[PDB]
Amino acid sequence: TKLTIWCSEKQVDILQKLGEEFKAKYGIPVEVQYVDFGSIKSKFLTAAPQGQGADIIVGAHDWVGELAVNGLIEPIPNFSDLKNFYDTALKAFSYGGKLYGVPYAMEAVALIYNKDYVDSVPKTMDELIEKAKQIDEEYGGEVRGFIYDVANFYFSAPFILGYGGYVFKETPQGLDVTDIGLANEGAVKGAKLIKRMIDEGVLTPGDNYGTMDSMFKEGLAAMIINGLWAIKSYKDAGINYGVAPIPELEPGVPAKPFVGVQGFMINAKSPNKVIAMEFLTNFIARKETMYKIYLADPRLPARKDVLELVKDNPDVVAFTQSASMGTPMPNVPEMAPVWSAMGDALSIIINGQASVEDALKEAVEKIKAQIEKGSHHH
Numbered sequence: 001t002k003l004t005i006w007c008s009e010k011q012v013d014i015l016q017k018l019g020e021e022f023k024a025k026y027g028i029p030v031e032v033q034y035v036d037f038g039s040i041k042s043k044f045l046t047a048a049p050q051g052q053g054a055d056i057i058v059g060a061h062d063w064v065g066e067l068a069v070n071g072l073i074e075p076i077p078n079f080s081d082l083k084n085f086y087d088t089a090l091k092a093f094s095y096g097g098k099l100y101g102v103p104y105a106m107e108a109v110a111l112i113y114n115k116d117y118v119d120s121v122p123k124t125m126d127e128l129i130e131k132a133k134q135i136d137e138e139y140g141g142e143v144r145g146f147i148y149d150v151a152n153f154y155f156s157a158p159f160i161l162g163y164g165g166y167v168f169k170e171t172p173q174g175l176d177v178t179d180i181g182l183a184n185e186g187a188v189k190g191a192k193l194i195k196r197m198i199d200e201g202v203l204t205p206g207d208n209y210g211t212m213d214s215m216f217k218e219g220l221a222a223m224i225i226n227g228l229w230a231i232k233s234y235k236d237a238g239i240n241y242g243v244a245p246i247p248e249l250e251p252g253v254p255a256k257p258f259v260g261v262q263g264f265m266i267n268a269k270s271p272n273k274v275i276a277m278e279f280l281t282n283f284i285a286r287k288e289t290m291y292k293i294y295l296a297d298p299r300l301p302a303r304k305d306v307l308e309l310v311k312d313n314p315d316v317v318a319f320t321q322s323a324s325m326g327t328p329m330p331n332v333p334e335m336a337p338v339w340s341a342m343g344d345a346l347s348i349i350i351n352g353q354a355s356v357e358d359a360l361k362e363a364v365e366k367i368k369a370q371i372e373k374g375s376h377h378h
């Protein structure tokens, strides 16, 4: 009789502290295990059917459909505190008419900049590119003017979607997963802006999340694209940072980031589901508990009465502005192959191995082929 939780490095300390509180009040020990974020879903897909998955996992709402149709996460029954959560957060964790998690936070990326190098936020992507090149020259390559995880579709989406790409078409009958918008004229235009930044040398093909995040924390990157999950580490590193929406792609044409929702899901195969349900609906979901989570992991709260406490914080203001321009990630099982296909296309594009139009058409054909083959069933 023990509850086990898998989560990323950002939640481990606070969830272990809250787990000791739950042990004091209910008598049940809680063990929190770090698992790298990019492996949680894959490890759970192989472990849970074997009886070796955690009771509770913490992660992003795009996973919900794939996990639900494979029978691996438990629906959450209605409970009266749900009226206090934002509908956008509850819809993101809903699939097939059922709620499949308790959300704790919403998030989007934004432009994060180091005020020691950036005095005026660029208003357009053209101005950002010019400012990055000036920094690159001024400090002789010791400081990067602009860097981000370029070949990760999650981080490059604001440019693709902003110009009119889309993942699946919205219809009155739901998402049409045969109508994929990732190689339309808008997607091409957004992918060409990415290529232009490579060609002009402000990004490189080797740029990745770890080097971005490390360089910013060391004071050697002026401008990055990242989310609220990183800001505490940058405050703790003593960086004098600011946050703004991603600059418009052209005048009057905004970037359009994904919106994500982070949340708690229960393993349907757990022998401890009954206690896991109490933990989530009668302890984690409470206003006081959700505010403690915010203090340790300061993303946008999913409960309105907690957001109300922190709504004046300038980081909350800026990231709310970014998220307001965004679109929630789809959560249908068919999202699963999209990330790999688009990551491969972006790698090809930035390495000059194919034209933008060709690389995106190949990506869409590969996604269609995976959907047709039922790759999302395990």
Ligand SMILES: OC[C@H]1O[C@H](O[C@H]2[C@H](O)[C@@H](O)[C@@H](O[C@H]3[C@H](O)[C@@H](O)[C@@H](O[C@H]4[C@H](O)[C@@H](O)[C@@H](O)O[C@@H]4CO)O[C@@H]3CO)O[C@@H]2CO)[C@H](O)[C@@H](O)[C@@H]1O
Residues within 6 Å of the ligand: 008, 009, 010, 011, 036, 037, 038, 039, 040, 041, 042, 060, 061, 062, 063, 107, 152, 153, 154, 209, 227, 229, 260, 339, 340
């Ligand atoms: O096939 C490639 C990979 O595809 C899938 O990964 C997706 C995720 O499912 C998406 O949710 C998204 O991931 C974002 C994530 O939403 C966002 O929060 C952020 O993640 C933070 C994390 O919240 C934080 O706690 C800490 O751990 O830092 C993470 C950032 O390093 O950024 C993620 C993007 O990197 O997009 C990815 C695709 O990149 C699939 O689940 C994977 O298993 C698969 O490998």
